[PDB]
Amino acid sequence: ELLEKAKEDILNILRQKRTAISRKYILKKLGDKYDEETIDDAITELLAQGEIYEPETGYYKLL
Amino acid sequence: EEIGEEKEYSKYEDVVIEWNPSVTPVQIEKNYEVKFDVRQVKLRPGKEGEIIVEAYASLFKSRLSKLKRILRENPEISNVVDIGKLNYVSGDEEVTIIGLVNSKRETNRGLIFEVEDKTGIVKVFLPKDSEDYREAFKVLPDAVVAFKGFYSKKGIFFANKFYLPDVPLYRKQKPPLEEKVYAILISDIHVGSREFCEKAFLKFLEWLNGHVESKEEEEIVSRVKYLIIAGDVVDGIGIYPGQYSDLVIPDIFDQYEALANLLANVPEHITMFIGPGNADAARPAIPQPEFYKEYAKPIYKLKNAIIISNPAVIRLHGRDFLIAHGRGIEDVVSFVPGLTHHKPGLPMVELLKMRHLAPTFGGKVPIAPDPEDLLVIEEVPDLVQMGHVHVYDAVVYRGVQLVNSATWQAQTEFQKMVNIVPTPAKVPVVDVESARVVKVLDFSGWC
Amino acid sequence: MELPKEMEEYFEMLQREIDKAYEIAKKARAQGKDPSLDVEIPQATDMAGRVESLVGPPGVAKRIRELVKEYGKEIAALKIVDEIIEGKFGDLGSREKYAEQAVRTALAILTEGIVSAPIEGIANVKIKRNTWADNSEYLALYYAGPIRSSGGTAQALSVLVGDYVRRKLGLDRFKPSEKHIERMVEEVDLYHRAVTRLQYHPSPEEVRLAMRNIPIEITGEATDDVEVSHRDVPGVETNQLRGGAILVLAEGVLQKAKKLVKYIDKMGIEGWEWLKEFVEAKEDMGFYYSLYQKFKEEIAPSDKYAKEVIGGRPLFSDPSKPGGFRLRYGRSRASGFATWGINPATMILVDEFLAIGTQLKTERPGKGAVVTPVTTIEGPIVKLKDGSVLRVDDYNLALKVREDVEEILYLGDAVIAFGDFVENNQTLLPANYCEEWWILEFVKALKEIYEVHLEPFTENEEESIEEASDYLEIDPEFLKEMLRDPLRVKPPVELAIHFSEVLGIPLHPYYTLYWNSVEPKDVEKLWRLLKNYAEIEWSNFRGIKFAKKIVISQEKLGDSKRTLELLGLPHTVRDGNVIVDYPWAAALLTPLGNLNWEFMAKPLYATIDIINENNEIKLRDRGISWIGARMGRPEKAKERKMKPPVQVLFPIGLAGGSSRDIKKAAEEGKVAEVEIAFFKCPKCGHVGPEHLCPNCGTRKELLWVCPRCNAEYPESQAEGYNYTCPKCNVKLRPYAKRKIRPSELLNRAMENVKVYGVDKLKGVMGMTSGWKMPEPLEKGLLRAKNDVYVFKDGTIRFDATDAPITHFRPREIGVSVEKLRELGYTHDFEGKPLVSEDQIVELKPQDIILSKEAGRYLLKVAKFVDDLLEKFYGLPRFYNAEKMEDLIGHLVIGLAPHTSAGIVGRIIGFVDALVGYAHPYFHAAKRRNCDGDEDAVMLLLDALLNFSRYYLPEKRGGKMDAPLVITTRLDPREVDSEVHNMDIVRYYPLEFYEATYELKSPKELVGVIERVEDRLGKPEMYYGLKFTHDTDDIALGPKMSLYKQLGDMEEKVRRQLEVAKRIRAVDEHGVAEKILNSHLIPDLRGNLRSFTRQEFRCVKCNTKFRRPPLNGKCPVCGGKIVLTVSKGAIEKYLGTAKMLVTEYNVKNYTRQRICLTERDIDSLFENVFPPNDICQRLVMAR
Ligand SMILES: [Fe+3]
Ligand SMILES: [Zn+2]
Ligand SMILES: [Zn+2]
Ligand SMILES: [Zn+2]
16 A cells, blocks of 8 residues: 555656656655655556656656 | 928919909009119129138228218318328317227217228217217217317317218209009018918908909009019028928928919019018028029019019109118117117118118128128118018108018017017008108908 | 954055155145145044034034934034024124024035035125015025036025024015016026026926025026126116026926925925925836837837937937847946946947947936946847848957948847936836846746755855756756856757756747747748748757758748848858858747747737747747937046146246246246235345245245235234234235246256256246245246146146946956055955955955056156155155056045045056046045046145145135045945945846836835945945946957047048948938037038128237228238138038938928028128039929
């Protein structure tokens, strides 16, 4: 369920700021709340679902 | 000085005034001759400044010679000696000096002058008790006068009389005329201005054509053969800063064309004499030979018009008419107190009894460089006409009649700034046999 | 006050130098060779001391100092007046004396003791009675000529003080008749018509309203010889026109009514209701379409500056027309007070009509301004002779491509400060888009998105820079350099586009073209042309497609090439093709979406609105606001000479000739009868104009003469006899008409100072002072040897234009860091130690930067002073200067022509321009601003040695422009009101820029931008001032104007009209008519009128005759008589007028006037001197 919460947080971050967001900012903001492996897992599940897409490497935006 | 956008105006191109069949003109032969005209004289033939100075010197020497010749005609003048020869004669012998006037000073016991002739300069003292003290009180500078008195070795000429070149007290009566002929004098039309009276001028043109209300006026119109204009026929351009906003026709060619269109309704049997003025397209200084032909052509082609100079002398049935624009009246008023505008006859009397149209130099009348002086009244006339004052008046002095034609322009702002109240639309009527004004017409009610 | 350590040390060092000068000055004067035995320039340190030493009464300084801190300097004047009336400062005598003293002291306190109004402007104070009305007493104030240069604010305060004094003395009001009011109404209009154009011309109703209520009379003595219609008015002694009184009435109470109302309200004066009442009675659509309309309605074009055009002074921009001067808000290092800042490239491309220090007649903010080079701002855009378009932002590029310039599409930028808008109460104009706005948007976007805090123009922390660089994937060094200097460091186009896409900010202002200068239909046609007939090369940058090159044929483009020129797009013409280069192809094709969406014109929309409606990257307007200007009064830097040059103040009469040469009179051995004072030796009885006896060596005593009996009395007897002759009972005089032998005096002086090789020595025809004391001839000999000149008081002066400066670099003024450390400078403006010549150092209040010409003249003056000290006084030398660089660290005195108080400065460097650089506080202390004013500098020791009160003219105005008291400390609280509006912030905030679009008055933004006024009282008003725009060099650009190399009028007019033709925002046809109506026709007509009413002159003598002599020669001399107004004067301007009429399209009125003038000039001279042309065609058409 922690993965689902992480996915919800990742979705919340991108909605508030309607622009492309770097990966480093997401990693820092999520930070101690979830370890890096879970962050990457959430990112790959979101890209598999198709909610978000990456224009460039290291940059993600809402889709 | 800012000039705005163009405007559309009229040139009086559709004005036609006909002749009444009731008035049948009387058949009178015409006797008009131009006795004097500036363009009739021929002037006799190197740094520019030297030639200009010589021209001015010759001008003043010619004035002195002519006015001396006029003075010597008085029988009471005798034993005239030159100023440079004053030391030869004794200190108790009566002598008479003739010369120009340089400076006049009023002291507590008399008048002190500085009189200059071609040979020297002397200082004169006129005692207060002298009978001819008021005449010396009004003499303008640059006028030729005479003094009669003794000379002291101290260097002062103590005079007891003062003379001026005047009009003789007696003149022979001219022979009569078989038929009666009238003449009309007008001036200062100022065509092209905002204050120009149009309806008054149209009513005037309808008066010359036989539309009259009274039988006596019907008698007068049938006997009119001459019309004379003296100066300011058009308003001009560039006279003073702020004139474009005060113009209806702001172009010189169309101004003269409009004047020609208005004047074409003058009846055929009437002959017109037109002369230049201050505002017209002519010479900046007086005397003025004529209008510029290339600018004032439309008034040259009228079949009953004669262009004359400023000044000129016209002989009508044996009677001499002196016609000048009359800018020298302003210099008299400034000098002598008690003579103001609205009574321009008295300054005219002063100018006539000095026998010079514009004596003072460096005042407010410009004098052109010329080897000979042409503003001297060489022969006593029968009638003198002037303008430039915009107020009507007429006086008689020793058999001559002096008339100041009025204006056709209403009160401008510049006049109400300096407090001059003009009299518009007044026309003198003169009789050739007597050279006197018999009636004054009033068209001022219309505009 | 408790100042920091640096400021107190600086002031103490200045005081030590002043004391060092004063010691030598005191030693020299005590020998007895001079008019007095003590130095005649006292020193004061505040307003109270100056007031005590200028107008008195004695003992007032302590009371002023006590009362100022308690009430606030406006109630203090009233308290001082009350105390003086009560007699606390002694018994003055009659009531008139009390009134005069009180009025002078109060006006001096309110004016701060600098302006010479209380000394010379006010002549008398008298009591008079209303004989016609009620026989009641009233107070009257008499004014002199000097009141005309005392300023508007000093004139009204005089009326206020007079009213208060008359109220305190228990007097009554002034009750005028109708004749008085009518005479005043006539007099004001007559003065305006005849002698001088008043700046503010009141209506007759306003004049009557003022005359009906002012409780005190405003009269004076006659200044001009012009008569008036209303004459013999009771209570007025002169029939001639009075100038000072009417200028006071027109300019103090009426023009400056609001300031007087404010003073009345703050002080508490009652009875001034009418002035307050008079003051209060006196006062479906696109975004940019609406903004333009509202701007046009609320702010209207002003054409007052362009009314008059003078030949040789060009017009650079039409009123509020695109293509003129762009408006940029800011303040440079060397501008801000009233000074504009322009790029030096603009100066070159206008044919150097503009040089550093040239005055400009400006439209919007104020009336006048001075130019100063700024390199950071943009420059002109030009079109070459082969069709290419270039951008010129460098001095070298302008120097290189000047000869190939065909059209100036845009002039450039102007830097105008916010303080000027506050001072002139000018409504804010919409701001153009610039780099400082963009950087603020950049940092705000970073803060909102990534929560990283950065500050422009400063040094940010390293970790924040690294974090931002990681987020944005750019080089941290580049980001640091861009944030530190956003004006000079700009990103490439691909970074600008990436920033716009990622961060959401608009496009960089550098890459934005003038899109709103073309109608949407032109862009619509250009879109199809580019889509069909253009070949474009593309490139990719991080997934963003941008153009690289555009090539299109000229024949297919057609008339769309003008759209590119109006857009300001650089391009070249080659082989019949138009090529657009790298950075500008992207600038043109990116705001259009790379031709993906079609551009269609629609009503009630602008180009930028259509772009922003359907494009991802937004833009902002770059050319919304424009300002026009005109040239006047070129820069000045030159020494001062009296109208005939004078080297010694010694009377010679006509014995020396026109040049008044004492040496020439000495060679011929002439005897001159002049009016001079002598002295008598107590022991041997020698009588001579010198002070020390040539035989004994003892000081002599002045001789007083009786005008009737001609008796000589020494000083002791004259003092004992109370300066009255016992026999005649008449007042004695110190001077008499006497005969002297110049040869003996000159030989004795030459033997005295061992100077023999002098060829010329010029004096004066007659002394003006009442004492008529002559200056020693040895001083004149030394001045002639060193080639220097003397003023009326006895000093040597240098006059130059004044410009402001606050920060400087050592390399600009040619001074090493070691010399600066010796001068007291230790840190730069950011707080770091001074180690390099490229750093920026703040300028101390009383340090000045001179010019090369000033140094060259002051070196001669220093040599003269050293020679004087060594030979005349027998004292060691002081300056010991061999080059102008040896004057660094020495002291001068600044003085203004309309004041009588000086301020001490110190030299620290030199520049090549013809200006005088100083702190704004320094110029404010002389009551001047930097909009074309000229001030004077003189060496301190020379003034101390040579200045004497005995040399001053007797008539009113002789104490004006003289160092009666100098000031040794500078206090910003008591300098001037204008400097308090100056802004001292480093950068303007976003609120200002966003508030510009709402067209707000500047008073609503005073709390946002810090100004000098907010620091008054605190120790922070002496240091910490800052600037917005930097500059590479303050003396870069042309030095001398082109107006000084042109002699003939025709050449002037030709160059002026060429400049008018080149500039796109100037109508040359309109300029052609302005010259004819303002400079040429008036002169022609005036000369033609004056020719026939002139005077005549002789060549040997100078006699004037009102009519030519008959014989053609001078009656006395026999010499030649010559004209005064010649034919050359009439015809000097005819050819130029004919050229203007024949070439340019002017109105018919002017053509006919010029043709008639030609005909009149030709016709006037007919008797004396017996083809496709404009006149012939004009007269042949009709
Ligand atoms: Fe007239
Ligand atoms: Zn002695
Ligand atoms: Zn005496
Ligand atoms: Zn002479």
